Design a protein around this ligand. Structure first.
Ligand code: L9W
Ligand code: CA
Length: 350
């Protein structure tokens, strides 16, 4: 990787999220989104390291602080859509063509820390919040499918979640140090997803009833000893990080225990490896994997970019010294984008 370009956003506020759109064709434009302050900005990656600003969405609320964004497509037309949320706990669905807000979802009793679209069903949006719960939305019928939390749910703010390869289960983590598994391929959850597609507030006067999932399918507080701010699946394995300067690769149960044969009572975990690094002991630092899950990338609090081949390397520039909050690889992994606390964007090409 070589640094081929760099730019700073005029608002000067930290950039907390960055996502390439992976739903674009080959030979179609390479687009990425950035979130920070009350803004969502679109960019196009061109030949010889050029970054072209497409458009920005500025939210009406000046005190809204976007923390996350995620890309989806309209199943019927294949046109891209972008979901954004943050400190207001409002989900906004933006039309990237016109950078206009199509619709919004209110529900969470505090800020939204991460947004994730279901890997198979583009209408299924997962939100994680400071209110201790996860929420699964059907953005086609504008319904709240399920609320994950309560009694045996997270006991503090949820910082991250990720679906497995096929979107049969979610793993979430937060300030309570725990990592919780929630199966969505249960009869109850599949009937709720099916039911949510048949709902229309125009054909009934009764509300749609959300599944209230009070108990996870697995839980552990044995991986990390501090806030768990990032979680991602690597097949049936889990990669998670705290602020203890390591990304831990682990799994529920014992060495030969199948994740789908694990009972909720399961008290064992198996650590399969660690990715050690330095100066990334501040809360809110995300790691990211490329489309193929062939590469791992994590930025540190002083502008260093760690990149590991999953089949280490440090990417530095003297002008890059602020905390790198999030990174994103293009679908083909040829480009890696890093976003910083000083509103700066850094482009690294293979
Ligand atoms: C410059 S400062 O004033 O010290 C500061 C620093 C961090 C935050 C902040 C960032 N991010 C989120 N949530 C999203 C999130 C969650 C997990 C990992 C992760 C992210 C974004 C990057 O890595 N926050 C929720 N509440 N505060 C925050 C706000 C102010
Ligand atoms: Ca399985």
């Amino acid at each position: 990787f070589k640094c081929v370009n760099s730019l700073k956003e005029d608002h000067n506020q930290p950039l907390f999220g960055v996502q390439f759109n992976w739903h674009s064709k080959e030979g179609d434009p390479l687009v990425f989104a950035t979130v920070g302050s009350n803004r969502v900005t679109l960019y196009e990656c061109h030949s010889q390291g050029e970054i072209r600003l497409l458009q920005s969405y500025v939210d009406a609320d000046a005190d809204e602080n976007f923390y996350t964004c995620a890309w989806t497509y309209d199943s019927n037309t294949s046109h891209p859509l972008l979901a954004v949320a943050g400190s207001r706990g409002i989900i906004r669905i933006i039309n990237p063509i016109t950078m206009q807000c199509i619709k919004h979802y209110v529900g969470h009793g505090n800020a939204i820390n991460e947004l994730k679209f279901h890997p198979r069903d583009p209408n299924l949006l997962l939100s994680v919040s400071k209110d201790h719960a996860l929420r699964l939305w059907n953005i086609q019928t504008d319904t709240l499918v399920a609320i994950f939390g309560g009694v045996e749910g997270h006991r503090d703010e949820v910082l991250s979640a990720d679906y497995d390869l096929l979107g049969e289960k979610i793993m979430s983590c937060g300030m309570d140090h725990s990592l919780k598994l929630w199966r969505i391929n249960s009869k109850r959850m599949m009937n709720a997803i099916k039911e949510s597609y048949d709902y229309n507030p125009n054909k009934t006067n009764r509300p749609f009833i959300s599944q209230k999932i009070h108990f996870p399918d697995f839980s552990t507080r044995d991986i990390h000893r501090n806030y768990v701010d990032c979680v991602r699946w690597l097949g049936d394995l889990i990669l998670s990080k705290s602020c203890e300067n390591a990304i831990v690769c682990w799994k529920p149960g014992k060495m030969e225990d199948d994740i789908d044969k694990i009972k909720p009572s399961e008290s064992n975990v198996t650590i399969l490896g660690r990715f050690d690094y330095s100066q990334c002991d501040i809360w809110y630092m995300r790691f990211s994997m490329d489309f193929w899950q062939k590469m791992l990338a994590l930025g540190n609090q002083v502008g260093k970019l760690y990149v590991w081949d999953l089949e280490c390397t440090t990417l530095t520039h003297h002008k890059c010294g602020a905390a790198i909050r999030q990174t994103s690889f293009s679908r083909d992994s040829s480009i890696l984008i890093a976003v910083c606390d000083d509103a700066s964007i850094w482009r690294w090409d293979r």
